[PDB]
Amino acid sequence: LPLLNYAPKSQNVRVEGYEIGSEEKPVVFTTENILSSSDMDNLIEAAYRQIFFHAFKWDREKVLESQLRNGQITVRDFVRGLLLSNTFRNSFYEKNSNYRFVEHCVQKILGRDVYSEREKIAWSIVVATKGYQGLIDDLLNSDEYLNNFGYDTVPYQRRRNLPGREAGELPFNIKSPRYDAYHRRQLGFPQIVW
Amino acid sequence: AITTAASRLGVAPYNESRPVELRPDFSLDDAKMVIRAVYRQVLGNDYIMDSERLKGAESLLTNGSISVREFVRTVAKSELYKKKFLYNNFQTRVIELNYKHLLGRAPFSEDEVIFHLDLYENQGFDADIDSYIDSVEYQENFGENIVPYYRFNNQVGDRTVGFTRMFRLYRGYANSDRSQLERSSSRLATELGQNTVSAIVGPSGSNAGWAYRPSRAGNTPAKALGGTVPFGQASKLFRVEITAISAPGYPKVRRSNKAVIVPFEQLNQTLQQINRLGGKVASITPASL
Amino acid sequence: MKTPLTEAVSTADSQGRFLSSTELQIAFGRLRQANAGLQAAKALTDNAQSLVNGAAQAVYNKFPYTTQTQGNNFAADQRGKDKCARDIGYYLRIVTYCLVAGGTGPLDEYLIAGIDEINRTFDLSPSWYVEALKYIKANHGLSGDARDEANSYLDYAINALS
Amino acid sequence: MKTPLTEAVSTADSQGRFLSSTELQIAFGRLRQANAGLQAAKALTDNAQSLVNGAAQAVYNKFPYTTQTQGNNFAADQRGKDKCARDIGYYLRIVTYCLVAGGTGPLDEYLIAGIDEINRTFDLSPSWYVEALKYIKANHGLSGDARDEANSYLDYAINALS
Amino acid sequence: MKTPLTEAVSTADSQGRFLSSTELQIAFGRLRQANAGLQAAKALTDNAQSLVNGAAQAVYNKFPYTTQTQGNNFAADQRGKDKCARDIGYYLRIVTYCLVAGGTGPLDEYLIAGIDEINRTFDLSPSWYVEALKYIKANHGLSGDARDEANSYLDYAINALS
């Protein structure tokens, strides 16, 4: 079935920004720069930060790293590998509803917030119908992903800050921790202290 | 032989040609045909100006004072050959060209580079030229009386790597060794040193992706080490070489040439994306087992 | 291909892990099943001719127009009857493969993926093949684990068609 | 959770599929194992205090400097001995969980994920815990499938620490 | 190259669709327009010298400092006057293309995209070109659909420049 239709909403990413490089421009981590080993570390760390927010040694995917380092795969392939990883499934899929999982995916992969509940609703059914991989591939193959990040750049949160303002929109790793009230209740938190 | 792909590979005209032999008691038209063939073969299909012709060597050939092989030898040792192919080239480039012109094939191994580089360095260009012409291989294929010609077809003594490398040196019929995209650069220095080969990209006109050439660094390896694991559920992997990428523009597009390894299940998406990049498929090759 | 052993390795590899007790238990489950699967495959293989012909007749009985109507998609002529018996033969043979592999892998890869496009393009009713699969289920003669596993694959095909 | 039943469903869900004979076979694998694991968990639990005490003493004996050297990370004082016996108790208890669950799931979720950071941050030697696990392997007195599954988990933790 | 025909196909192709009534109507819309466009292209082509010379002169009159200030970007010497007349010719010629193509495609591909960078790099004022395009609008003599379409392309360039 075709994806349920929904309308956009006004967003920074939807309009021309007249951007000039500053300390608030997301760093472009691309393999098109022929990155040295240490510089490849930073690109890999950036990808872990973008997708996981933090990769403990348990979370890391050393074989995917080697393949990216060797040119076997593109950055987008590395990002897919992270999205397909055990850490991503366990942290962001299993601990959330399909609706919140979609939000995480849109935020992490496309670098923007969702338009509305209806966008979350429309995509929530994709895992069930096309399978988990089908959802990731749709987003990674989307014109929005490719136009912004292509094959060789680590995705990032887009147009978060506007010039001359003290603060931007909330970073997604603050706005969207890996789980929320639903899983918090199951764990029996918050803990009464004192 | 080469039949179905002959035309797109630029081989069909050579399939349609016979070796140019100078028979004993040859006629003058025979001598003219040899002279034309030798100039086209040995000088890599460069245009030859009347002022550049080797009139004396042509006279001696016409008179039977020198055989075909000795005429080839004279052309190869001439200031004309050296100006075209020696004075401006890395010696590995020179060796590539000598092999193409005088033996009609590409070098097989690094050992050939070692031999000819040392011979040039120790005894000079003339000595090196003689080694090609006095070689067993030259004798067996061309002998005294036949102009050298491209040996596309499989022969005794061949190696497969020779076949792929001929299309690094031969770039089509309406083309010369001095009018190719890589210009003066050695085509095979890296292939020989690493004993690797490259996917064959046929000549322009009959192949949209004819211009695909890899960069110095940051290339995609030939084979999919790691298999399908990084791609998730995938049946088989292919290496696609893509050229002429322009549409997004810089900095979204950095290098117009790119090779990607993609799964079978994304080939439809890949071709669609390539088209929208403006790019042209140069080659597709299975990358996994 | 969906089979216990390959799925166990596929999961562990996707997690970059050595095999652990979970995967060993998958292997023990396969071992518990495999002989019954192999025995069922042999039984269906030995009665393939009767099963396929019987199944094809079953369809013809339930859908008489298929043997009376003219058209490329029907079996009123010998050409059509041979296509139909061939097709039912495919369903049966690929089911035996599922019993050998211990999963729907063979059905998924060889027969099911794309079947809807084929039946739509050549105007073949899924209901015909469902009837043939029902006949095989009622006539293969299996029992116990062989029967259960065999019927799952037949019901798997039936469900894919409806 | 790395557990046969959870992964069977996780994989089927990830694939949008109904469960099939492949997943039923995984379940049979689980049932073959489960009683041995439950029996192993009981035996380990009943002997829990002795195993923990023996394991800590094994560590202290192999690494006497841990009971002699002042420092927050060492067991020279009663505080550190209590921490140590607590840590070892965690390993044993979570190992019994893996036997109940039939997979490394509990070890991964509760102990292994992040253990590298803990040991580095608090200057705790992984070799200390490896010694304690080897003691438990040597002294739990299990046999047959119970021994094998229990040793797979103890070795799994040993491998994680080395 | 935005034209009714290519956009209709590209849209359908992006959707993996055969052409349908919607694209056929787009074709009919193109057909209703094309002859008027070709006639407009013919008229402009025949009057090209006068339009270009008058356009350049109208610019010099409105911006007399251009013909009297020394500098690579001005038209004080014959070099600059030739550059200027050439540029205006480009606008006119590419506009006739848009009339032939039936869309802004030729303007977008050949002139508009990147014009901002050109004018900034070489210190050419967009107002100059606006003045020339207004002259061509007022002196091309077209009427009816030929006028409307031609003015739309002339206006399109004017908008891009302002």
Place this chain on the structure above:
Amino acid sequence: MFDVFTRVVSQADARGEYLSGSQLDALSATVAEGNKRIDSVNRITGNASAIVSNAARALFAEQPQLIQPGGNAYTSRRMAACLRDMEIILRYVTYATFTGDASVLEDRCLNGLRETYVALGVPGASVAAGVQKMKEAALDIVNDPNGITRGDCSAIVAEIAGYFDRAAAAVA
């Protein structure tokens, strides 16, 4: 998500306790039921298309307003979406039956489903009616005594019925 085994472990870990003797024996009892549980999952799965299609037909007969023009299940897309939902819910019910725990059904299928139907205007009570029709069909299929080692499946059937009830209540 939890299965029957990891549900108990998670509770013990949060308490810092080993499973007790009665907990281990309870899980031993579950294991003794394992073959029946596998049979029930196999039977529902084998009939999934029939359970959905028959339930859908019955629902639209009892509630014709759904399929009248303008009805929520009118138009091909909405009808297909409706059939898809019934199959998804049935599938997640089988998942819960397989693992012996409701978490997979609660977390993946039911969590937030009520609000989604409210947002879309899907009639939640009609869905629950459809789920109850699938429930009745499924239990009969599980309880059928033909072609299976005869025994008492009353416990598993009650467990399965509970899962269908959980789904029906989550949307109505």
Place this chain on the structure above:
Amino acid sequence: MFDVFTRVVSQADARGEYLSGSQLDALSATVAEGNKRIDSVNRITGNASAIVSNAARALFAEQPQLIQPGGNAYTSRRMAACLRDMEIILRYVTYATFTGDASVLEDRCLNGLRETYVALGVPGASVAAGVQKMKEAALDIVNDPNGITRGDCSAIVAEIAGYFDRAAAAVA
């Protein structure tokens, strides 16, 4: 991609020339054929499914090797892929017919197609045979004199034939 108009434009631009009076007259003649062009696209499109499935049936009847076990069109997934490829080529041929230029076909259908088929082991000559069958079916549909205003469509039918021939040449 180009269409018949922008093809002329691009050639004119590369020489910095206005379209000559003769070039304009040629395009005006193209405009007069537009209705026939629109009819041909419409008739092919309206019969696309029959064109593909008939041609496919004919191809497999003449080349049973393709569909016997181990043949490149055996298994549903490969059969489906094969039928899809036929429809794709037909679709792009109509695109070329619509625009009056082969660029769309060359750039977006045939770009890398031969390479793909070799890499996959798809028999190119058999694809070309299939394309030829679609061509014959299509041209008969385009030339059908019933239910349409009568005229000479030979100029367009020849153009369409060339687009089919171009596709068949590219897959070999």
Place this chain on the structure above:
Amino acid sequence: MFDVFTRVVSQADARGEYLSGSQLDALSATVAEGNKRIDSVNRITGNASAIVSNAARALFAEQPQLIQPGGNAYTSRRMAACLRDMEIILRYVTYATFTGDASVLEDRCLNGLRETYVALGVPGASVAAGVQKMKEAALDIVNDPNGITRGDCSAIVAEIAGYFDRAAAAVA
């Protein structure tokens, strides 16, 4: 990838044939070795860290040029990669043992590995030497008569040895 079962299935389907009695019998014999196969996988897995580290220590002892400054395994990241590569190979050998088919090892670990090492300057012959050491340690562990139901594992051990030998041969 293929396991032992689907390797035979895949071959049969290409020929359009049912598995023969001998093919089914041979697979039955494989099933009878299943317990030994599982035991060997478990034993190698349980000793994986020791197999890798001990082999690496022996390698560097025998080949000090590797770990001299400027050597291929000098610097932490290169030493880490080297240890990683050893572990990757051992892991895939256990995968091949588990499935009873070399395809997983060949496609996911060995394909393209020689070329990578040549391109990087990794001494493939040294890698092979390290693989041999892992082989020796692993086979001894698999053959340990103690703590296991006594029986003949010679055939499985040979199959495992062949997987190691393939790995060593592949890296040059």
